[PDB]
Amino acid sequence: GPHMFEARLVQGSILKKVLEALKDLINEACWDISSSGVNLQSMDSSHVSLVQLTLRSEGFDTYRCDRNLAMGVNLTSMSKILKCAGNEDIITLRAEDNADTLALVFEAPNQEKVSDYEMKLMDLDVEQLGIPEQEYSCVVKMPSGEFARICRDLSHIGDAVVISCAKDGVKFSASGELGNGNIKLSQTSNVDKEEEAVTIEMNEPVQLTFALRYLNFFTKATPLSSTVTLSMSADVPLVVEYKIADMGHLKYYLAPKI
Amino acid sequence: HMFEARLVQGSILKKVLEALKDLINEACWDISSSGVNLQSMDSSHVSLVQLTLRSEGFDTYRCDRNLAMGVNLTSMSKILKCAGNEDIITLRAEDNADTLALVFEAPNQEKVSDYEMKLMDLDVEQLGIPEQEYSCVVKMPSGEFARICRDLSHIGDAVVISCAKDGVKFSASGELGNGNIKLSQTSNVDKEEEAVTIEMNEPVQLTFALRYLNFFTKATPLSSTVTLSMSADVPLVVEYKIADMGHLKYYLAPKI
């Protein structure tokens, strides 16, 4: 009858974390909902970085989407509400087309407790995503807690970081009034569990500079992925990518300096 | 002529003060043969808190004369942060002078601290709390109730409590939207103290200030369960059983 969108996710906490990963950088955004899945795509208010989020429908335990629809969300409101959900809660979303409210329903495992929140939506016009899939001079894959530790540490030294990678490894550098710091990461040839590995794919050495404010925001994704992947070219934007396992990915895009 | 109570589970005394300190700046402690009795309104007269510690619950209880010791709850809390959690704690007073003595002992027995706190002169102020039946009484885990007030406070500043025979709902509104939380009565002899139990003589639908409920949930460490007693036009009672030894009761009136 009415055109429904409805998604049941048993590991609700994924959705929770996803919002932690967004709320501090994006205030509001359109969710593109189709049968492919849930797709989100927005630039932060200072127009320097772009987040893009993909939750494929097969990732959801239940998924229905009668026709493509788009919902303007206040990620701040959405985050507040998701803090009301249990880490073990089963989470359902539910809206009809042209809705002014989103239903979020949180089910405890025992089925003796149930919460529901009707969240106000907004009307937002969101177009575009003229993002060509592209070839990078360097791709680097490493533990997400390590990358996060690095950004955390270099942000005591300075507020920009030079990334420089070669065949053998990648180096991160900052500098300020305290002093200079250089963190160097070499390829784990070895033989290991992917959450400790360091792997480099390379066509040509890049050496690029990025502001560490932004990087430090991207790292709020850290709970979503054991790894994180960085892709670099001359003055193409850097992309920082987290695999939300068996559901999709979360990619941040940053513009280098000069 | 002297008062002295020794409490082994001294932590209880800590949790009790952590639960009052934020609501109440000063209260009078009524001491008598039958135990300890504290009653107070909060600084703005909206709510009332009542605390009973029966003398049977102490390992040692001695009370020559009835006293009313005026205490600053915030100083007394500072002094009890200095007690370890496994500390055997003793209260001691001399009727004359107004000093209360808090003695802490390590169960190792190699360390002993005494703190002498100054007392105030306060107004002796009881309010008569009436014996009562309630239309609905909800027993639930103190943590779930605590979670519920916290979450709804992100939604609005009032919570509507709708109580049926075999479930209760907690709803809020505000600029973000609505929220509703439904607990069903539990089968039980599952578990024990994660049972939700409703006794309903008369269905209620009552509105309360989340501002105050969240002060009440500070007592959550004192008990695994909380009880809610409700009627139309009658203060809500939020009760925390302290061990085998007493209770902390909070009173808050509903809309109209």
Partner: peptide
Amino acid sequence: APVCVRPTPKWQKGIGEFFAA
């Protein structure tokens, strides 16, 4: 979730209106 700061509502009657001394 830390607990929001919520103001005392308009309709709030004091407990003194229910119990006497």
